Motif scaffolding. Sequence first.
Motif, PDB file in Angstrom:
ATOM      1  N   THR A   1       7.937  -7.084  32.660  1.00 49.15           N
ATOM      2  CA  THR A   1       8.886  -7.434  33.724  1.00 49.15           C
ATOM      3  C   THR A   1       9.460  -6.174  34.342  1.00 49.15           C
ATOM      4  O   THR A   1       9.897  -5.271  33.630  1.00 49.15           O
ATOM      5  CB  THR A   1      10.074  -8.258  33.188  1.00 49.15           C
TER       6      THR A   1
ATOM      7  N   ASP B   1      11.313 -12.645  35.437  1.00 50.86           N
ATOM      8  CA  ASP B   1      11.672 -12.654  34.010  1.00 50.86           C
ATOM      9  C   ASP B   1      11.108 -13.883  33.299  1.00 50.86           C
ATOM     10  O   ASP B   1      10.652 -13.793  32.156  1.00 50.86           O
ATOM     11  CB  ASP B   1      13.193 -12.600  33.821  1.00 50.86           C
ATOM     12  N   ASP B   2      11.114 -15.016  34.005  1.00 49.65           N
ATOM     13  CA  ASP B   2      10.866 -16.326  33.403  1.00 49.65           C
ATOM     14  C   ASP B   2       9.731 -17.112  34.050  1.00 49.65           C
ATOM     15  O   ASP B   2       9.250 -18.098  33.481  1.00 49.65           O
ATOM     16  CB  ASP B   2      12.163 -17.131  33.410  1.00 49.65           C
TER      17      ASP B   2
ATOM     18  N   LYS C   1      21.640  -9.142  40.430  1.00 52.12           N
ATOM     19  CA  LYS C   1      21.512  -9.388  38.993  1.00 52.12           C
ATOM     20  C   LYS C   1      22.830  -9.179  38.226  1.00 52.12           C
ATOM     21  O   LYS C   1      22.937  -9.559  37.057  1.00 52.12           O
ATOM     22  CB  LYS C   1      20.358  -8.563  38.404  1.00 52.12           C
TER      23      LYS C   1
ATOM     24  N   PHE D   1      12.080 -11.050  40.483  1.00 54.16           N
ATOM     25  CA  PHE D   1      12.728 -12.094  39.690  1.00 54.16           C
ATOM     26  C   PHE D   1      11.707 -12.888  38.877  1.00 54.16           C
ATOM     27  O   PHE D   1      11.701 -14.131  38.878  1.00 54.16           O
ATOM     28  CB  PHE D   1      13.587 -12.998  40.585  1.00 54.16           C
TER      29      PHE D   1
ATOM     30  N   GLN E   1      18.702 -15.029  39.312  1.00 56.96           N
ATOM     31  CA  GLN E   1      18.062 -14.844  37.999  1.00 56.96           C
ATOM     32  C   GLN E   1      18.312 -16.038  37.071  1.00 56.96           C
ATOM     33  O   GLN E   1      17.384 -16.528  36.423  1.00 56.96           O
ATOM     34  CB  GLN E   1      18.495 -13.532  37.327  1.00 56.96           C
TER      35      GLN E   1
ATOM     36  N   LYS F   1      15.569 -18.893  35.833  1.00 65.86           N
ATOM     37  CA  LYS F   1      15.569 -19.195  34.396  1.00 65.86           C
ATOM     38  C   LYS F   1      15.718 -20.698  34.146  1.00 65.86           C
ATOM     39  O   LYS F   1      14.932 -21.285  33.401  1.00 65.86           O
ATOM     40  CB  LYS F   1      16.674 -18.396  33.675  1.00 65.86           C
TER      41      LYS F   1
ATOM     42  N   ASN G   1      23.578 -17.014  41.919  1.00 65.82           N
ATOM     43  CA  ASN G   1      22.931 -16.333  40.797  1.00 65.82           C
ATOM     44  C   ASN G   1      21.453 -16.724  40.718  1.00 65.82           C
ATOM     45  O   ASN G   1      21.102 -17.751  40.124  1.00 65.82           O
ATOM     46  CB  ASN G   1      23.668 -16.663  39.485  1.00 65.82           C
TER      47      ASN G   1
END
Lengths: 337, 337
Positions: free
Chosen positions: A257, B254-255, B55, B252, B192, B196, B190
């Motif tokens: 990431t 991460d997930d 973030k 973005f 991020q 998620k 938000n």
Amino acid sequence: ESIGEIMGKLMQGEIGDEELSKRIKEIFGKRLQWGYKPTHQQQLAFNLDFIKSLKEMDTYELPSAFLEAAFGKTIKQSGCYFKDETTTIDEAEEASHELYCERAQIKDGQTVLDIGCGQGGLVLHIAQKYKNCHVTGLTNSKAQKNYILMQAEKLQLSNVDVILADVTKHESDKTYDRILVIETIEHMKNIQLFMKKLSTWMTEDSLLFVDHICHKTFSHHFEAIDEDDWYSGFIFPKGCVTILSASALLYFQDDVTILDHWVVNGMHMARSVDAWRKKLDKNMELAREILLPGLGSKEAVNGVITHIRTFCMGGYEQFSYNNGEEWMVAQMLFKKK
Amino acid sequence: ESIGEIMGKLMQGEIGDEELSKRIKEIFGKRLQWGYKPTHQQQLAFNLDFIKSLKEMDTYELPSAFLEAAFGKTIKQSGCYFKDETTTIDEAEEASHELYCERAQIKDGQTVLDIGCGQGGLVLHIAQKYKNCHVTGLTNSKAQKNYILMQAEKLQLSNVDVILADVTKHESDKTYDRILVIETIEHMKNIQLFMKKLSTWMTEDSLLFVDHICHKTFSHHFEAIDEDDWYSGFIFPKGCVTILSASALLYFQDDVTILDHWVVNGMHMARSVDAWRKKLDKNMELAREILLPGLGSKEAVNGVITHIRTFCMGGYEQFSYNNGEEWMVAQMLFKKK
Ligand SMILES: C[S@@+](CC[C@H](N)C(=O)[O-])C[C@H]1O[C@@H](n2cnc3c(N)ncnc32)[C@H](O)[C@@H]1O
Ligand SMILES: C[S@@+](CC[C@H](N)C(=O)[O-])C[C@H]1O[C@@H](n2cnc3c(N)ncnc32)[C@H](O)[C@@H]1O
């Protein structure tokens, strides 16, 4: 005029520097025409086609004495960083090493792996600056491994080891706090598999730092577009080098990431290849003498020198194009997923 | 001239369309000056600063009769797609719905969630086209939920449900084969945390499709740069809308992981807001009559109409800027990590 005719004149030293630069600039100009699209819609279509194509894919060495005569002090074989017009290549190597240490967030005590470490300038820099770091260089060249180990011995460095491996075939359960890849990803045939492999050598605390030559807008293989390009296939005879766009690696986040993203303007690379070209020219007689025993004839020596010198001349045109705002260097910092 | 003076003339209908367009174009021109940097090095520094900042972060509704008088048939409140100069707003809604179905790889039998579904045009489109799909709309508006359920009843659709929720507060273990977010991410404080949350509503087989208004190069909040911008804070009185760059969501991951990426040129959005403006103008008398009971006075009606009409006029200047090559629509397709 044919490819062979231009190549004949080049090898005989009949093309002056002015004409040579002009010819190579025109070749790169045509690459820009090829890569830029009229709309961002078309640009992204073009760029994603290239990214998708990547995800479907997959004896002689120069003596150290010659390399020392052409390159800077630590024989860095990557873009350097020049604060001033009068910054020397030695200073530019150190400045670039320092830039990597800052951006990769290197701290004393970390385990550090440098993938495709070359002649080990960065390995030696980190080892000397951070005595509690253990630093591992990984290279596919036995000569390079031997060079690094000799230098570590001369510098009284006890925190260096070198893995001799093709990185694509290297298997280990070992993990590292920091993984650095300085202008090596360009040579990777399978990038998704490469990034996956690197992620398995990371823990949750690890960071990965990648530096690669790029174009700011589009990606391309380093190859001839048409029959008028004598240059690309002369420099890299195989289809081994990929020039990713400045953003291409953002699409390779299956296993890592992104945390940060930078580019360094192409004039830094331009000044790097210019410094190598000028140093080679200064040490021309010495270089010819060094290369003669290992190559067998003056003609074979001339050919090798012409190749490296033309690489620098062409590199200058490529990276200086539009004051460094076309081809440049991309840098990215990642954590594991 | 002051903010209040321009605002006074606007509300009284003293600014002609030519001057209004000119004023708003100039405001957006200044935003371009603010956002474009001299080098890609500086551009990425600017862009990453914005991404990093994201973030760190975190009663009255228009009657359906008015919405029907201003918007197209399904009251789509997002950029549409216009094949021709003479494509109607109704046709453009359907074309855009079809584009989302293709790019999100919608197939009969899938469970589908539409986040911030608005008046439910896309929900109803998928439900009708794919009878074995179950389609869930999620909206924070009770009026919107009621509208969708009435339309589903009228259309003999038995495969629709609506969740009434603030998406940022919605908790569920339910997963969906397809999650669609059509011009809703712009309102997320938000991002991020939002991405998620969406990933927890996905399985390994799921895909996520996001469509958002963007600028091709840089990100910005929809707000006044300086005191000369009367427009931005008039359109969105709170700091609630973010215009991400065309590439911002690539940071973005991460997930979720990117699979494809497109932009749709801004002229499509321009033609959308133009169609709404022209339809409102045509139905002006009717619109004034509809709004009068719920707003209490002709002056309050004029204010609401001025707001929506100016939104369209300003939107036209924004998205048509440089033939649609500044502000446009970004689309991305993701899988779960
Ligand atoms: C341009 S150099 C950069 C070297 C060094 N990082 C530096 O900055 O000076 C690229 C290096 O990657 C190495 N390399 C290429 N393919 C490799 C592989 N499969 N395994 C290990 N090293 C490789 C090359 O031998 C070369 O030394
Ligand atoms: C511009 S509209 C787009 C609506 C619809 N997707 C379309 O294409 O017509 C944005 C929608 O997101 C909704 N929205 C904003 N914040 C929300 C939240 N926290 N939860 C649910 N919906 C929200 C708004 O009410 C609005 O209907």
